[PDB]
Amino acid sequence: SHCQKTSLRVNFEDIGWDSWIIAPKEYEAYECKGGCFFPLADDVTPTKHAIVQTLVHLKFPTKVGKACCVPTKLSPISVLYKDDMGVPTLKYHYEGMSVAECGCR
Amino acid sequence: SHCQKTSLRVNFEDIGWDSWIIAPKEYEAYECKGGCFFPLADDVTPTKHAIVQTLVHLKFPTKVGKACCVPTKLSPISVLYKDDMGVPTLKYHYEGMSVAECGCR
Ligand SMILES: [Cl-]
Ligand SMILES: [Cl-]
Ligand SMILES: [Cl-]
Ligand SMILES: [Cl-]
Ligand SMILES: [Cl-]
Ligand SMILES: [Cl-]
Ligand SMILES: [Cl-]
Ligand SMILES: [Cl-]
Ligand SMILES: [Cl-]
Ligand SMILES: [Cl-]
Ligand code: NA
Ligand code: NA
Ligand code: NA
Ligand code: NA
Ligand code: NA
Ligand code: NA
Ligand code: NA
Ligand code: NA
């Protein structure tokens, strides 16, 4: 039950972006969920600082928070958007929209 | 009160690393602390996914967790360590030990 990519389907109208995004209506953003506690998995790929903070958090749980399961690499998607003039326009690689990799940081 | 680098002084014996680290006894690791909620600061430098997840978390706080204030760039330190033979040896750039930048991810 450690840090990993799980599914997260995002509807653009729900987050108030339908005003400038015609299509798609929903996309697969994924999310990173899970713990960063010891012992770790063989593919968490954690930084030295995340390891140190996890140890410090264990010894002082009230003073220092835990490390975090976050996206460590993102992928683009394509969106059809009405530009400032108002015409549908394709953005082929809308960067940073979907999780490619998760990790403890 | 948004995501920012705050101080975190780490003692190597407290985290059980004194067995292979002779010096220094403590170092300044810093940590990233604060919220990732709207409105954001001019220097959070958040990814598109962190922005999307924050919106989804606002609309569905029980199903989707918040974005995270984590280190986005790390700096090295120097440590004196007894090697596998047992002699003090300098590691000049022990990478990923201290926070250089924080951000919402
Ligand atoms: Cl481990
Ligand atoms: Cl590292
Ligand atoms: Cl593009
Ligand atoms: Cl291409
Ligand atoms: Cl982009
Ligand atoms: Cl904002
Ligand atoms: Cl991005
Ligand atoms: Cl080095
Ligand atoms: Cl150098
Ligand atoms: Cl290193
Ligand atoms: Na949604
Ligand atoms: Na949905
Ligand atoms: Na404590
Ligand atoms: Na292509
Ligand atoms: Na400590
Ligand atoms: Na200390
Ligand atoms: Na909810
Ligand atoms: Na140098």
Numbering used by the authors:
A (entry chain A), B (entry chain A): 325 to 429
The authors write:
BMP-9 and BMP-10 are TGF-β family signaling ligands naturally secreted into blood. BMP-9 and −10 are synthesized as pro-proteins and processed by furin to release growth factors comprised of two cystine-knotted protomers that can covalently homo- or hetero-dimerize via a single cysteine in the dimer interface. Unlike other ligands of the TGF-β family, BMP-9 and −10 are secreted as a mixture of disulfide-linked dimers and monomers, in which the interchain cysteine (Cys-392) remains either paired or unpaired.
The interchain disulfide remains unbroken in the first fraction of the 32 and 64 splits, but is broken and the cysteines are free in the last fraction of all splits. In the first fraction of the 64 split, automated fit functions still placed the sulfurs beyond disulfide bonding distance, but a manual fit to the omit-map density produces a perfect syn-periplanar (0°) χ3 dihedral angle Cβ-S-S′-Cβ′ with full occupancy. While the observed χ1 dihedral angle of Cys-392 is both an uncommon and high energy conformation, the χ3 dihedral angle (Cβ-S-S′-Cβ′) of the Cys-392-Cys-392’ disulfide is an extreme outlier as the χ3 adopts a syn-periplanar conformation placing the Cβ atoms directly across from each other in the same plane. The intrachain cystines have no outlier dihedral angles and all disulfide bond distances, both inter and intrachain, were acceptable for this resolution. The interchain cystine of BMP-9 has one of the highest energy conformations possible,, yet this is the dominant conformation prior to radiation damage. This is surprising, unless no lower energy conformations are accessible. Analysis of the BMP-9 disulfide-linked dimer structure revealed a highly strained syn-periplanar interchain cystine prior to radiation damage, and an unstrained free cysteine after irradiation.
